[PDB]
């Protein structure tokens, strides 16, 4: 079902997606332990993810949410890092793998590409701060609907949870959904973290 369409660096769609990647990098409280030490990425490839069934599933649910929330899907574009990115682009998101988490900060999602807290890092060097091995992240279209505000299935009468960072100073929000149909994996981004100079 799924085809991946390569986007050219000269395409405005490539450029807008890359800019969201780069401009949402932040410093983390672990000093780079989980995701590595970097201020920007080397973008190697951006692919548009096209799948008819997963898209129709996304839009059907989006309409339901919208009608339960004064015609407002509250749709966002958010990052998702996972060792299971290949399964996600072909089979879509699945809540049973308790919710499904998404980040406004690309560098937050980058912490989860090799597993929880970075796991043991890249397969070949076992380095969580590897500047060599290629990483992959999803930039996803996400339906939040009526989102339950959390100061840091979904709560009754809500479609999602918003984790508003209270303690952290420069952190952006993180979101949780409980229905896999409320997220569509729209862009597959292949990159390296870049060593600072
Ligand atoms: C549920 N098992 C523990 C657990 C493991 C990972 C995550 C988690 N929190 C996130 C916040 C965020 F902004 C983005 C992500 C995550 C994840 C893992 C899923 N991917 C994310 O990018 C949450 C809970
Ligand atoms: Zn490596």
**What is the 121 CA–ligand 2 centroid distance (Å)?**
8
**Nearest ligand, CA of residue 112?**
1
**Residue 50, marked binder:** no
- The domains located in the chain, with CATH, are 1-197 (3.90.228.10)
> By the 8 A CB rule, do 181 and 56 touch?
no
Give CA–CA dist 107/75, Å, rounded. Answer: 21
Nearest CA-CA partner of 192 in 36, 70, 74: 36
**Nearest ligand, CA of residue 119?**
1
Experimental method: X-ray
**Residue 130, marked binder:** yes
User: Is the C-alpha dihedral spanning 166, 29, 98, 77 positive or negative?
Assistant: positive
Q: Which ranges of the chain would DSSP assign to H, the alpha helix?
A: 12-23, 52-67, 85-91, 106-110
Closest ligand 1 atom to Cα of 102:
14
**What is the 33 CA–ligand 1 centroid distance (Å)?**
16
User: Is the C-alpha dihedral spanning 17, 41, 99, 91 positive or negative?
Assistant: positive
């Amino acid at each position: 079902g799924t085809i991946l369409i390569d986007l050219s660096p000269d395409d405005k769609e490539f450029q807008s997606v890359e800019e969201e990647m780069q401009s949402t990098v932040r410093e983390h409280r672990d000093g780079g332990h989980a995701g590595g030490i970097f201020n920007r990425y080397n973008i190697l490839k951006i692919q548009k993810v096209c799948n008819k069934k997963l898209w129709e599933r996304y839009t059907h649910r989006r309409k339901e949410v919208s009608e339960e929330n004064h015609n407002h899907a509250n749709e966002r574009m958010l990052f998702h890092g996972s060792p299971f990115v290949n399964a996600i682009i072909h089979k879509g998101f699945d809540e049973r793998h308790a919710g499904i988490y998404f980040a406004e900060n690309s560098s937050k999602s980058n912490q989860y590409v090799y597993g929880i807290g970075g796991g043991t890092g890249c397969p070949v060097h076992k380095d969580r701060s590897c500047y060599i091995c290629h990483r992959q992240l999803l930039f996803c279209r996400v339906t939040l609907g009526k989102s339950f505000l959390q100061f840091s299935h979904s709560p009754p009468g809500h479609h999602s949870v918003t984790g508003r960072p209270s303690v952290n100073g420069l952190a952006l929000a993180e979101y949780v959904i409980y229905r896999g149909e409320q997220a569509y994996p729209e862009y597959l981004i292949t990159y390296q973290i870049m060593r600072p100079e």
